[PDB]
Enzyme design. Structure first.
Site, PDB file in Angstrom:
ATOM      1  CB  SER A  23      68.572  61.235  47.034  1.00 52.06           C
ATOM      2  OG  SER A  23      68.136  59.514  46.723  1.00 52.06           O
ATOM      3  CD  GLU A  63      82.498  70.527  61.160  1.00 52.15           C
ATOM      4  OE1 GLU A  63      82.717  71.323  60.272  1.00 52.15           O
ATOM      5  OE2 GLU A  63      83.277  70.937  62.432  1.00 52.15           O
ATOM      6  N   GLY A  96      73.574  58.566  43.752  1.00 51.44           N
ATOM      7  CA  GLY A  96      74.660  56.663  43.359  1.00 51.44           C
ATOM      8  C   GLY A  96      74.771  57.086  44.835  1.00 51.44           C
ATOM      9  CG  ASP A 139      83.868  63.529  42.257  1.00 53.71           C
ATOM     10  OD1 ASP A 139      84.241  64.231  41.198  1.00 53.71           O
ATOM     11  OD2 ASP A 139      82.772  63.142  42.488  1.00 53.71           O
ATOM     12  CE  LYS A 185      78.126  60.385  52.555  1.00 51.26           C
ATOM     13  NZ  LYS A 185      79.261  61.658  52.468  1.00 51.26           N
ATOM     14  CB  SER A 190      69.365  58.320  51.854  1.00 45.85           C
ATOM     15  OG  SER A 190      69.327  58.078  50.644  1.00 45.85           O
TER      16      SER A 190
END
Ligand SMILES: COc1ccc2c(c1)[nH]c(=O)c1sc3ccccc3c12
Length: 273
Positions: A14, A89, A16, A135, A35, A19
């Site tokens: 969970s 996956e 920003g 990121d 997701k 989930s």
């Protein structure tokens, strides 16, 4: 529908982003991850080569999911009233590198050599596919523990690869290169090398090298752990302040420290089983 085709299990995460639930594809008991992301909170949209207007994460996922890689693939997706749902996956068993390092501390150099290589191959893959991750960190790397195979996740902060300058960055502060701190400008490749420099440090030291902006622009790495004279070199080089002094992916992968990489099963044999 999503509720028909996939048996929802527990919740894995969970934030920003959204989930994420563990899930089973009914049609052959394949593990997946589901997701969910509210449209409300979607920062950056895109359009896929069918026309259809989706979030950027989805386009990127489609592009890199050609052939095999160390990239968690997209298998499916669904739009809803107020959300999109993504089937990814799920490997089994699996732990992310942020947990792995938190649990087991600084990694032996042989193990870090395998993982880093793997990450480099995966990032290379993304760049061939027109995609920049942006990121790249421990939290975004899953370790399939049986195969010893690293896999890349979360393209929420990702973008199409380009040669001109970037002027946003919804990724983490500490992993942010100094060119962004100082000027709010960077280039994808060079900054990717910056985050890989931070990643390699984390692996071998157990923790990230810079806590604050002033330390980042300082550009100075103190090793708290016994690290080879060779690994320290490669880290310092990836974390060179002027981006044009940072190495390329090729230069990283020919650096002496990146010689004699164990393959993934061998790595698991020794370090994970
Ligand atoms: C605690 O934060 C998490 C934790 C897990 C994920 C995650 C974020 N984001 C993901 O895109 C994926 S995909 C995937 C596949 C298998 C198992 C976990 C994940 C996660």
């Amino acid at each position: 529908p999503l509720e028909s085709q996939y048996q929802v299990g527990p919740l894995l995460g969970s934030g920003g982003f959204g989930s994420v639930y563990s899930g089973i594809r009914v049609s052959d008991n394949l593990p997946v991850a589901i997701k969910h992301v509210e449209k409300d909170r979607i920062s950056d949209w895109g359009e896929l080569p069918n026309g259809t207007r989706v979030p950027m994460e989805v386009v990127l996922l489609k592009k890199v999911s050609s052939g095999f890689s160390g990239v968690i693939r997209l298998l499916d997706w669904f739009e809803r009233p107020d959300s999109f749902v993504l089937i990814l996956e799920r490997p089994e068993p699996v732990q992310d590198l942020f947990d792995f390092i938190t649990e087991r501390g600084a990694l032996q150099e042989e193990l870090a050599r395998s993982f880093f290589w793997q990450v480099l191959e995966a990032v290379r893959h993304c760049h061939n596919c027109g995609v920049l991750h942006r990121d790249i960190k421990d939290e975004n790397i899953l370790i399939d523990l049986n195969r010893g195979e690293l896999k890349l996740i979360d393209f929420g902060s990702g973008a199409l690869l380009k040669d001109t300058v970037y002027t946003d960055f919804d990724g983490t502060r500490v992993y942010s290169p100094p060119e962004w701190i100082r000027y709010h400008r960077y280039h994808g490749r060079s900054a990717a090398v910056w985050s890989l420099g931070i990643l390699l440090y984390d692996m071998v030291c157990g923790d990230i090298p810079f806590e604050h902006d002033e330390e980042i622009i300082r550009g100075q790495v103190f090793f708290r752990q016994r690290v080879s004279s060779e690994c320290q070199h490669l880290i310092r080089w990836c974390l060179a302040l002027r981006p044009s002094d940072r190495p390329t992916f090729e230069e990283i992968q020919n650096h002496p420290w990146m010689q004699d990489v164990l393959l993934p099963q061998e790595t698991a044999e020794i370090h994970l089983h």
